[PDB]
């Protein structure tokens, strides 16, 4: 099914309200950009634009094994292009070139002359599409990336749909009809027209603002399959949520209301309700974010009660939120706010709260029990049950309650209330009145023949959140049977007292003379709101469990918190979704079933570990209490004073990161390379499986003492006679082994991925020292597949990557950057350590299963959707599945498996502006091993003076060291033991193999016994080949005799255009016989199976040939490097008209063609002038016409040396031929097939 689908891009002047650059007031006026498409080929006749279209994403639904073509027409002023996600293409629109400085390979991207189509021709196949067990239809997206500032001012995102067919058989007629949800961000400050500022940044959804956005529909209870996609490329965020229904998949019930600032989710919604649905934002100012929408109605189509009645009450309870005082200790500037001043009120705050109370005495305030306040009541009920809750408000100000998740509520007695209110939203509650709510659970509480053991739901009030959060109204809901008593679940309730009414009474209750605050200062409003964790801090919350009980762990949270929170319990690894992980972030409205086992106690000081909290002196201590030879591992730390650069960025930056070492003394670091590029400016890469401890004797040399934290310290109750804490703070020159035993339960099922990845950090200074650079990852596997001592496994290649923010203020080294011998300098962005598109080293096998460990930590602005461009990665959930949805999350780290069938350079995406503006591209390269060819020196393409060395002597040249050359001078003699010869490759191509031979002088068979290859890229960053494992230093064995030729391959290839070889071990004399063997990343210089003489002779055609009675000199007979009588090719006569046609059956770009002479009769032949043609239909003739005379190259030095007509520039069209003009004695040409089958 060929899809003729076209696209266009234009700019409009519209405000999306109907039906010199200064703000104007009501609805203002601006210019907004939108895509417009013409289905027909008239470009002038367009179907009318509906008032509900706006910026709604143009979908492109596709089918497997079907070709799709997309075009675009330029109606703007600047060139743009389209960028794809997860689709294999051929770089025609990638938009990010590299260090070539060559002619127009793909330099048409930012070049769009008026018009042009520039079709892409995508291809979907079995690997490109879903499988049977995969979801019925997945989703993609597309966005331009060639233009940075224009896209940040346009934000014109598109959507894609790719999956199998199914519209041919009997399918439900609910698919397509063009429904999709997107989000956008508006700004035009740096537009082409462009215009102190007074211009804020706002967002728009589906291209409609202020009520002009329809789309909210209700219909029958049909399983509609609609996905929601969204992305953010700008700083700051906004609250967005949905009310209608939760996201339910298959037979596992998930009630997740996952509506995040950024979301790429493939799921469906269930449209059970008939009516209106609402999206709300947590912003007080209604002018900002006014996307309220009314209802548009259309039709999509045409377990027993038992007595569980309990009493629920409400009463106030005053609590001192800081029972412990630590004011005298003024060690870390903490006591600046502890001294009375403009805004010091105190700690006694009174407000009516909600919690259970068994009895109904109500004479005075009695003191309830410790650790059981501030929490809400537990509620247990059944389907269709009756239950009465007594509700009361101490203050005259009305509070109200409204259940969540419960839809079946009918008016009492009468269907319509005669009063002036016809809904349950505003029902007055007298301070002491009695009122109940009729609830009835739906029928999907118990599925067919599978009554669930237990499930997770929870409710609260959803009527007066602008005020409910000021009063702390939360109620737990336990809903299931025996398969509890201890109820001390941690909660986040931040006290918003500015909205609380009792503050206005506190004003005179606490301050007799408020003349010094004026009550109009915003700083008191900002300070008044204090952060609390379940109402108890300063060593006041505890918990304790043990083994062999029928009970599960439960943890809940309510509140969006305006940011992200990171809380967890070190030491105990909870099971979240059958995956074992330590550090889980806190996202609002989430609830799961979990159980944690009590295995090891241990007291270590720690906090809530948030970026901005834990500063108040909160510990939240758990205190669970009770009811073969190993591999030496070392971690070091050193500072490298290395500024990143001066051109395209004295100031100097020293960074200290975790390393790996060999022994206690700082003599040998065991420096490695290739496969262990992971270090960079990151931590070390540790391979460990089981039973081997890490006796890391961490000790710094550096210049100042600091500390190291394993993040998995597993010790028994050591330090007896009192549980004193760990001092840590490793000073230089000390011995302290941090060593712990890996656990067997931290290894997944064999059918699952066998190796799991975690990380470690330093707990003392996350933002002072860890953000200075000391962050280190770790890796733990299971079983034993890394056999032998060093593990030549060649199954999976393993790297990892990390994101963070580096600032100069975080480092300690501000004032001494002078070597101690406007304000743009304040804004630095950390990308793996190095910037300016020059971080290579991610080399990987072309065709093999490869496992990756995504990792990312740090602040808020260091997590975002990142994936390798143009690939397909997925994770197996106990079955074969294929989904490419996995992004960066704090702490949540898992393993992914993928294999790229294609080759070439790719690019790391950047979906955040502040980092794409830094100039980040940590690209990677992949090779093909099949290449075997000398790459410039054995055949003498290189020039003379481009090779230089120390000293030169008459009648001695080392260049003669080419292959199969001997006789007199075949080396260069020098008394000094070692030597160095530098040859440049003129380009950074791939290097695979190295070969050598021995020479003969006098009566000796000279050679080189052993040597090592070393290389670099610019002569200032020297590094050698330290791959293949099997020992840190390996010695390369040389030849054993004069005629010894061998073949060897480097498993990690060498990436360099320069190379210097240092023969340390030499045979008597400084023998110099070097032969470089190489290739390019294309790998398109091999015969296409034509070596087989069994191939058909009718597959090769021509104009004419040697035709006579003895016509056996066929053109295909003249094959390169074949022994035989008269084995050459001669035309019918001495005419230039004869060509050498070949079987094409596809369009190809020429790379190189070789031609040889014939070895018969011993006569030299050579060719001076010739020509090369090109045709597509046998009519036209267009070639590489340059600078007057067509580019001509001269070859055929003798009758025997072959020459390859490597045609770098594109000689297009489906016909390449040659015509020999110059000739000696008689025409006799020998040829060979070259190239590949691709594109």
């Amino acid at each position, epitope marked *: 099914a060929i899809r003729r689908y076209y696209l266009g891009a234009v700019e409009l002047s519209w405000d999306y309200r109907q039906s010199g650059a200064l703000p104007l007031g009501p609805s203002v006026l601006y210019k907004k950009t939108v895509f417009v498409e013409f289905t027909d080929q008239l470009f002038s006749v367009a179907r009318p634009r509906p008032p509900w279209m706006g910026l709604l994403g143009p979908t492109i639904q596709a089918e497997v094994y079907d070709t799709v073509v997309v075009t675009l027409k330029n109606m703007a002023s600047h060139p743009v292009s389209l960028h794809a996600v997860g689709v294999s293409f051929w770089k025609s629109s990638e938009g990010a070139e590299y260090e070539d400085h060559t002619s127009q390979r793909e330099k048409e991207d930012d070049k769009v002359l008026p018009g042009k189509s520039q079709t892409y021709v995508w291809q979907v196949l079995k690997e490109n599409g879903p499988t049977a067990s995969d979801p019925p239809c997945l989703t993609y997206s597309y966005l331009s990336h060639v233009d940075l500032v224009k896209d940040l001012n346009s934000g014109l995102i598109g959507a894609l749909l790719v999956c199998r067919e199914g519209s041919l058989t009997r399918e439900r007629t609910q698919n397509l009809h063009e429904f999709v949800l997107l989000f956008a961000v508006f700004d035009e400050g740096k537009s082409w027209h462009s215009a102190a500022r007074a211009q804020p940044a706002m967002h728009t959804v589906n291209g409609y603002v202020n009520r002009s956005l329809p789309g909210l529909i209700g219909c029958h209870k049909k399983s509609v399959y609609w996905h929601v996609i969204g992305m953010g490329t700008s700083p700051e965020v906004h609250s967005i949520f949905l009310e209608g229904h939760t996201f339910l998949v298959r037979h596992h019930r998930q009630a997740s209301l996952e509506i995040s600032p950024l979301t790429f989710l493939t799921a469906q919604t269930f449209l059970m309700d008939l009516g209106q649905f609402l999206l709300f934002c947590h912003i007080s100012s209604h002018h900002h974010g006014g996307m309220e929408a009314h209802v548009r109605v259309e039709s999509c189509a045409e377990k027993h009660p038992k007595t569980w009645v309990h009493y629920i009450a409400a009463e106030e309870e005053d609590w001192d939120y800081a029972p412990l005082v630590l004011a005298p200790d003024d060690r870390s500037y903490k006591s600046q706010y502890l001294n009375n001043g403009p805004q010091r009120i105190g700690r006694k705050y009174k407000k009516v709260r909600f919690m259970a109370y068994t009895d109904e005495t109500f004479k005075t305030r009695e003191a309830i029990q410790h650790e059981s306040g501030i929490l809400g009541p537990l509620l247990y009920g059944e389907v269709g049950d009756t239950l009465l809750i007594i509700f009361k408000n101490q203050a005259s100000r009305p509070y109200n309650i409204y259940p969540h998740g419960i839809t079946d509520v009918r008016p009492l007695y009468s269907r319509r209330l005669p009063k002036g209110v016809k809904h349950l939203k505003d029902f007055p509650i007298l301070p002491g009145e009695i009122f109940k709510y009729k609830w009835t659970v739906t029928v999907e509480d118990g599925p067919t023949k599978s009554d669930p053991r237990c499930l997770t739901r929870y409710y609260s009030s959803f009527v007066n959140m602008e005020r409910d959060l000021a009063s702390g109204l939360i109620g737990p809901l336990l809903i299931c049977y025996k398969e509890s008593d201890k109820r001390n679940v941690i909660l986040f309730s931040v006290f918003d007292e500015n909205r609380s009414w009792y503050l206005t009474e506190n004003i005179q209750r606490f301050l007799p003379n408020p003349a010094g605050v004026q009550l109009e200062d915003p700083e008191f409003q900002a300070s008044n709101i204090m952060h609390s964790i379940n109402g108890y801090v300063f060593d006041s919350l505890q918990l304790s469990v043990c083994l062999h009980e029928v009970a599960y762990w439960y943890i809940l949270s309510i509140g969006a918190q305006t940011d992200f929170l990171s809380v967890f319990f070190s030491g105990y690894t909870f099971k979240h979704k059958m995956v074992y992980e330590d550090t889980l972030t806190l996202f609002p409205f989430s609830g799961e079933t979990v159980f944690m086992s009590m295995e090891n106690p241990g007291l270590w000081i720690l906090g809530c570990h948030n970026s901005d909290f834990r500063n108040r002196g909160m510990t939240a201590l758990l205190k669970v209490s009770s009811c073969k030879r190993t591999r030496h591992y070392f971690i070091a730390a050193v500072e490298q004073l290395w500024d990143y650069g001066m051109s395209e960025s004295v100031p100097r930056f020293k960074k200290v990161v975790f390393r790996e070492f060999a022994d206690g003394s700082f003599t040998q670091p065991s420096y490695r390379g290739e496969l262990n590029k992971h270090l960079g400016l990151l931590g070390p890469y540790i391979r460990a499986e089981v039973e081997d401890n890490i006796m890391v004797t961490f000790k710094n040399q550096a210049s100042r003492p600091y500390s190291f934290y394993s993040s998995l310290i597993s010790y028994p109750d050591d330090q007896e006679q009192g549980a004193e804490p760990r001092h840590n703070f490793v000073q230089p020159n000390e011995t302290r082994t941090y060593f712990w035993k890996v656990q067997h339960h931290m290894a997944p099922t064999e059918d699952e991925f066998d190796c799991k990845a975690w990380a470690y950090f330093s707990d003392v200074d996350l933002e002072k020292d860890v953000h200075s650079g000391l962050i280190g990852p770790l890796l733990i596997c299971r079983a034993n597949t890394l056999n032998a001592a060093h593990g030549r496994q060649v199954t999976v290649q393993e790297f990892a990557l990390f994101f963070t923010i580096f600032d100069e203020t975080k480092s300690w080294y501000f004032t001494e950057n002078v070597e101690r011998n406007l304000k743009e300098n304040y804004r630095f962005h950390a990308i793996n350590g190095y910037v300016m598109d020059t971080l290579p080293g991610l080399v990987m096998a072309q065709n093999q299963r490869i496992r990756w460990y995504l990792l990312s930590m740090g602040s808020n602005e260091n997590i975002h959707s990142i994936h390798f461009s143009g690939h397909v990665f997925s994770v197996r959930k106990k079955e074969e599945y294929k989904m490419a949805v996995y992004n960066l999350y704090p702490g949540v780290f898992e393993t992914v498996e993928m294999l790229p069938s294609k080759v070439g350079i790719w690019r790391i995406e950047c979906l955040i502006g502040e980092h794409l503006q830094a100039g980040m591209s940590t690209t990677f390269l992949v090779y093909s091993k099949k290449c075997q060819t000398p790459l410039g020196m054995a055949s003498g393409h290189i020039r003379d003076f481009q090779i230089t060395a120390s000293g030169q002597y008459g009648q001695w040249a080392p260049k003669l060291a080419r292959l199969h050359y001997s006789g007199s001078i075949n080396a260069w003699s020098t*008394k000094e033991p070692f030597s160095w010869i530098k040859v440049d490759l003129l380009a950074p191509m791939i290097i695979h193999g190295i070969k050598t031979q021995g020479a003969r002088q*006098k*009566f*000796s*068979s000279l050679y080189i016994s052993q040597f090592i290859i070393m290389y670099s890229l610019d002569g200032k960053k020297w590094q050698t080949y330290r791959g293949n494992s099997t020992g840190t230093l390996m010695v390369f064995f040389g030849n054993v005799d004069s005629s010894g030729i061998k073949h060897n391959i480097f498993n990690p290839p060498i990436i360099a255009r320069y190379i210097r070889l240092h023969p340390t071990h030499y045979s*008597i004399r400084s023998t110099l016989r070097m032969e470089l063997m190489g290739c390019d990343l294309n790998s398109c210089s091999m015969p296409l199976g034509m070596e087989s003489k069994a191939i058909s002779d009718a597959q090769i055609t021509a104009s004419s040939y040697f035709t006579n009675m003895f016509a056996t000199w066929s053109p295909s007979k003249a094959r390169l490097h074949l022994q035989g009588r008269s084995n050459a090719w001669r035309p019918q006569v001495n005419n230039p008209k004869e060509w050498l046609q070949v079987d094409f059956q596809k369009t190809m770009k020429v790379t190189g063609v070789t031609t040889q002479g014939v070895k018969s009769l011993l006569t030299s032949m050579y060719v001076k002038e010739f020509l090369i043609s090109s045709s597509q239909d046998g009519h036209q003739w267009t070639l590489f016409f340059q600078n007057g005379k067509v580019k001509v190259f001269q070859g055929n030095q003798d009758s025997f040396t072959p020459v390859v007509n490597s045609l770098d520039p594109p000689l297009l069209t489906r016909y390449l031929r040659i015509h020999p003009q110059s000739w000696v004695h008689q025409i006799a040409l020998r040829m060979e097939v070259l190239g590949c089958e691709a594109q």
Partner: antibody
Amino acid sequence: EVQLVESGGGVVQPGRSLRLSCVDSGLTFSSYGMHWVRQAPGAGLEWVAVISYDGNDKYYADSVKGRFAISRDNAKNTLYLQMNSLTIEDTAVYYCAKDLIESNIAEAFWGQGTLVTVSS
Amino acid sequence: DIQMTQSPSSLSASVGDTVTIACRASRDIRNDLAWYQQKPGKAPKLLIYATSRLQSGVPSRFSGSGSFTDFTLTINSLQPDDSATYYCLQDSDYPLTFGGGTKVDIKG
């Protein structure tokens, strides 16, 4: 390096022939390790000229001495002197030597020999 | 086609002298020729390496030089040990002829 030791006899007597050989201790030789020479003060290297050159050939300008058949090959150097007719032509301070190739201690070790005369 | 002779065959002079011995070659050859010193009753042994680089440890009396066709052996210390037979020999395959032997005579 490798020491050279002789294994044979040098006393000549008309009526019978013996075999001459020189053997090393370690075969750090190549396929071109064959030459023969003796003493001739104020004269050539046999009496007016050298026995042989050309690496592995028994020939200088005339009188090809192919009769000097060589037994075994490669890492051993040996050739038989015809004591039946040369006689006085085979009397000198003999050396078993060969131009070494490593050249780190002494490029050319030499034999010792003894006083030899005709049997009267 | 190398045909070389050796001159002279005998000599005698006073003390504190410095002379040089040479051999006439035929055509272009290399600097690596042989020089064995044989006193009357000692095995001929080389003292200068390749005639181009003086071997380490060899006394300063012997100092060889020359290339192409000419070669010069300079003496720096005079002794009555002049009884020593030299031989100008080239290392090559093509037909070559070496020197005749310089055995000096003792005056009385």
